[PDB]
């Protein structure tokens, strides 16, 4: 159901963009049809061309030349997913996504969310698996990078939601750890505070996954530095774009650059 | 109500003989009641501490001073169980089951075994889990050394089970993985020929896990050396005695040598 139209050049086509061309080539679109029901999504450009993808959603912006990622509705999603599914644990092999990106008024994205979460996230690293075809997947990722709406009545900070063990805590395959002490979000998760997420300009993340380590700087400084042998077994990967913690909203990222680099 | 008796002096008391009172203090027993339904099993010296445990199944053999494990039943179990749950990927740290292994008279055992199996598995790696609570337990050992009865044709032989992957192939947590390539026999396992089993003759096996490697030398020779990164995340431990994968016998092994030593 997800269509593609750049509404008569309104839109300018991501894959026509230099900036954006070899992340587009070494990924792929996984896309909620926003009229379509919870949880649904899509995948387009499974081999990394992106010639032809572009919508109301997904575009470069003609004037800032901003990669731009939209989504309505509670846990709808538009993302770019980088296929390579990576080791986390070999000192040899460091995988890095860089991006600077500029949320879009989210205080009014959320004016009417009856979320408790009431987050917008922007970058992931998550899990594949085991292997690359998925066994074993754990249905938490490693990192959510978020812009969220009130911790504790600090408002509109950037924040890295860190999962801190390998255990499935939710669904199906999570029953018998639901209840477990290494499932509750004060051990499952590690909260880290990226400071203010500021209007009208853009905030560079760079993540750097490898070597047990999950590195994040922010603006050029140093704000996660965290140990993840816990999770050497699970082949991981980055997304970036938009998927939304909160309800009756649109949420809207500008992307003045994404990229990908991986050092072996 | 497994109990225990050194018939009235008949039977030596393991903790009173000094070559197995160290592997015993830092082991448990791991016993069916022989009495008992399908799958059963008991837990004793929880502490390691064995005075008072023996009885027919599991006693020392006071002319040889053998360690005899004995049980009845398909997938009823005998066994000393290490309690150290240890780390398989770390270089600096090594862990060694060392045993001098008779079987007796084994074909008789499976006299009347209807069972396409026909092994007896007297030393065993297994997998806790993720942590020493056996998160994710993974339900197939990393490794079984078993006598078995024909291979093939091939006769009275010692034989390395190997686990390949860390993948769950069986139960409730393995439907989605049991019919997919993974999980299928002869990629699930790898199987290594230890050679024939003698008569009335002890037989050296010395395991050693760590360093991503398990390592089997059998009489002194090198037979296994079996890259396991792939089980790195998996906390694993050592077990010893007779499981049963033979129908309506009695499997009986003597232990004239069981250390577990550390190396760390």
Chains 1, 2 share one sequence.
Not at 73 to 81: C, G
């Amino acid at each position: 159901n997800v269509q593609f139209s750049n509404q008569d050049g309104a839109l300018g086509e991501p894959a026509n963009y230099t900036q954006f061309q070899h992340v587009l080539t070494e990924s792929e679109l996984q896309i909620s049809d926003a009229e379509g029901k919870k949880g649904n999504k899509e995948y387009f450009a499974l081999d990394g061309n992106f010639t032809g993808i572009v919508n109301q959603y997904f575009y470069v912006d003609k004037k800032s030349e901003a990669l731009v990622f939209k989504m309505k509705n509670d846990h709808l999603r538009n993302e770019v997913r980088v296929h390579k599914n990576f080791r986390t644990d070999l000192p040899n092999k460091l995988y890095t996504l860089s991006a600077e990106v500029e949320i879009i008024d989210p205080v009014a994205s959320m004016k009417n969310s009856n979320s408790k979460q009431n987050e917008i996230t922007f970058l992931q690293v998550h899990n594949k698996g085991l292997d690359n075809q998925g066994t074993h997947n754990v249905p938490h990722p490693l990192l959510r990078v978020v812009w969220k709406e009130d911790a504790n009545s600090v408002k509109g900070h950037f924040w890295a939601m860190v999962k801190n063990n390998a255990v499935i805590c939710k669904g199906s395959f999570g029953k018998k750890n639901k209840d477990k002490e290494m499932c509750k979000a004060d051990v499952a998760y590690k909260k880290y505070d990226l400071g203010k997420a500021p209007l009208n300009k853009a905030t560079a993340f760079d993540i750097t996954v490898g070597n047990k380590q999950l590195i994040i700087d922010v603006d050029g400084k140093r704000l996660v530095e965290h140990d993840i042998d816990y999770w050497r077994h699970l082949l991981s990967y980055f997304k970036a774009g938009v998927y939304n913690q909160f309800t009756n909203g649109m949420s809207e990222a500008h992307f003045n650059k994404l990229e990908y680099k991986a050092l072996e």
